[PDB]
Amino acid sequence: STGSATTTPIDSLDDAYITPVQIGTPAQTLNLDFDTGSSDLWVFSSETTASEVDGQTIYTPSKSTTAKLLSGATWSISYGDGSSSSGDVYTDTVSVGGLTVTGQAVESAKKVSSSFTEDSTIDGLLGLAFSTLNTVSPTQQKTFFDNAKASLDSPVFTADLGYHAPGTYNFGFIDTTAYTGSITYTAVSTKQGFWEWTSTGYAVGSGTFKSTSIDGIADTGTTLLYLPATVVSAYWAQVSGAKSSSSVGGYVFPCSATLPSFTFGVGSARIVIPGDYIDFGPISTGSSSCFGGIQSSAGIGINIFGDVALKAAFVVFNGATTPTLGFASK
Numbered sequence: 001s002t003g004s005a006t007t008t009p010i011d012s013l014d015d016a017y018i019t020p021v022q023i024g025t026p027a028q029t030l031n032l033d034f035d036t037g038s039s040d041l042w043v044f045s046s047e048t049t050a051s052e053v054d055g056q057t058i059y060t061p062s063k064s065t066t067a068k069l070l071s072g073a074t075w076s077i078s079y080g081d082g083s084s085s086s087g088d089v090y091t092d093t094v095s096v097g098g099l100t101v102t103g104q105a106v107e108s109a110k111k112v113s114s115s116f117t118e119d120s121t122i123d124g125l126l127g128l129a130f131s132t133l134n135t136v137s138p139t140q141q142k143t144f145f146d147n148a149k150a151s152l153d154s155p156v157f158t159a160d161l162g163y164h165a166p167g168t169y170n171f172g173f174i175d176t177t178a179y180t181g182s183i184t185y186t187a188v189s190t191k192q193g194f195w196e197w198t199s200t201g202y203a204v205g206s207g208t209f210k211s212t213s214i215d216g217i218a219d220t221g222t223t224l225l226y227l228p229a230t231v232v233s234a235y236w237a238q239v240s241g242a243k244s245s246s247s248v249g250g251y252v253f254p255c256s257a258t259l260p261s262f263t264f265g266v267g268s269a270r271i272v273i274p275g276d277y278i279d280f281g282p283i284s285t286g287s288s289s290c291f292g293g294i295q296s297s298a299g300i301g302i303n304i305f306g307d308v309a310l311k312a313a314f315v316v317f318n319g320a321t322t323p324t325l326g327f328a329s330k
Helices: 144-151 229-236
Strands: 003-009 017-023 028-035 041-043 068-078 084-096 099-112 124-127 156-160 167-171 180-187 196-204 210-218 225-227 243-245 250-254 262-266 269-273 279-282 289-292 294-296 303-305 314-318 324-329
Touching (some): 003 084, 210 225, 229 294, 250 294, 269 324
Parallel strands (some): 041 099, 210 303
Antiparallel strands (some): 003 017, 003 167, 041 124, 068 084, 084 099, 156 167, 156 314, 180 324, 196 262, 225 303, 243 250, 250 289, 262 269, 279 289, 314 324
């Protein structure tokens, strides 16, 4: 079997992407944030603290004939951005783009932190990292992809994120019309639970390519590109007036600037991020100071190939016995 679903930016900056997901019987459609950087599928629900819901669509398990409480199971998760959520667990039928999993753990939010409440466009998250990071206790649960894997024509999914435009998540097949040239595959370490790989280096604008290993994770759930301070400094030094602002929380630059591209290496291949992709607009409404899309990972503890990088490519998440990552231009 296969699935194919369109994923849509939540706002004009591509801060995140939502993909419609059918949960329960009859279907309850929720718009979820597909996150290759975590492994919980959780949703706003009829159990969510009422004050903490502001415009989201909720999952009501009592209205689903196929929902069953997973007795005793709870979950609790905190993300790199400081946000969090927690609750209990149902199993139910879950379909993404025509692909159906029965018995999927659907984690029902009792509590969510303010950033989730404040984002009315996201009804929950669908984790696509490795199931070893799933937070359900006392019995850890499998991700949607993990559950679907054996039924899929091929044990893969692909992320094809658009720049200021819709894109596609495919499950079980590689759309050879969706990219140009060939796909370069690179090794993955699952040791931390992530789609962790090593980039072979970088270039800034039309500059010469710097060969250097950069360990990081492919994370659709993170907006920006987080890299070592050396790399980030090298990039922003090519933008007149750019500086790191402790008050704002990263590199800013004059909104009058034309940004250079940023190239990253995948084995011998190269993915080019256009400069426009690195512009995240005024730090505040009307400001002439703009926020940069490439930021330092120092103090995160890991480098993150977030949406800024991934939307410049067609990305294959290969969940074969020996997982790998593929990148193509598009």
